[PDB]
Amino acid sequence: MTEYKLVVVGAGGVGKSALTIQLIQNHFVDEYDPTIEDSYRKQVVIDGETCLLDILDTAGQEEYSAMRDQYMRTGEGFLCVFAINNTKSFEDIHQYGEQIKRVKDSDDVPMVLVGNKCDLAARTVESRQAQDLARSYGIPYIETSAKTRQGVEDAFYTLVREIRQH
Ligand SMILES: Nc1nc2c(ncn2[C@@H]2O[C@H](COP(=O)(O)OP(=O)(O)NP(=O)(O)O)[C@@H](O)[C@H]2O)c(=O)[nH]1
Ligand SMILES: [Ca+2]
Numbered sequence: 373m374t375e376y377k378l379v380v381v382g383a384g385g386v387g388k389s390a391l392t393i394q395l396i397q398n399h400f401v402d403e404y405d406p407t408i409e410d411s412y413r414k415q416v417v418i419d420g421e422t423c424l425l426d427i428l429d430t431a432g433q434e435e436y437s438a439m440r441d442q443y444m445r446t447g448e449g450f451l452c453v454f455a456i457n458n459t460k461s462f463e464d465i466h467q468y469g470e471q472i473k474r475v476k477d478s479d480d481v482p483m484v485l486v487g488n489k490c491d492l493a494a495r496t497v498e499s500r501q502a503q504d505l506a507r508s509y510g511i512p513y514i515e516t517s518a519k520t521r522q523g524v525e526d527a528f529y530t531l532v533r534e535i536r537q538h
């Protein structure tokens with residue numbers, strides 16, 4: 373049974389925890405409790421393969437930026453999340469990508485760019501703007517709503533499929 377070490381990263385409040393909890397526990401967290409560092413594990417079948425997802429849900433609140441180097445070393449794939457109603461969170465993605473990129477000493481780290489909260493109408497990050505960022509990384513862009521579950525399984529499973537291309 374393959375184990376996949378996924379790490380969810382991004383700015384505070386973008387929905388990292390709500391996405392992970394929707395995937396693992398199938399409900400929507402309406403309240404905002406800032407995360408330090410939590411882990412989840414679940415056995416799932418992906419493309420006929422039983423595997424174990426080990427998901428690290430990280431802090432976006434800039435206090436715990438010191439713990440970033442630790443988890444960027446352990447993780448095999450990174451879900452890089454911003455919120456489509458938060459332009460600053462989109463601009464912050466670089467800081468996360470470069471950090472992963474620097475820490476891993478690799479321009480070839482399994483990653484997926486996630487535009488979350490696509491159920492909200494106050495969009496300030498257009499899909500094409502995020503597609504361009506993902507293209508320069510050579511990674512997929514996927515929009516999600518942790519609230520409606522739109523795209524949630526697709527985002528995490530796509531990251532597993534990125535790890536599998538090595
Ligand atoms: N409408 C909507 N709200 C969402 C969505 N995802 C998260 N939220 C809301 O946004 C707030 C923050 O979500 P949360 O998952 O805690 O964010 P986070 O990125 O884990 N924060 P932190 O980095 O501090 O741990 C919560 O009120 C949550 O309900 C989404 O897809 N749609
Ligand atoms: Ca709820």
Ligand SMILES: [Mg+2]
Pocket residue numbers: 388389390405406407429430431432
């Ligand atoms: Mg959180």
Ligand SMILES: [Mg+2]
Pocket residue numbers: 496
């Ligand atoms: Mg604009």
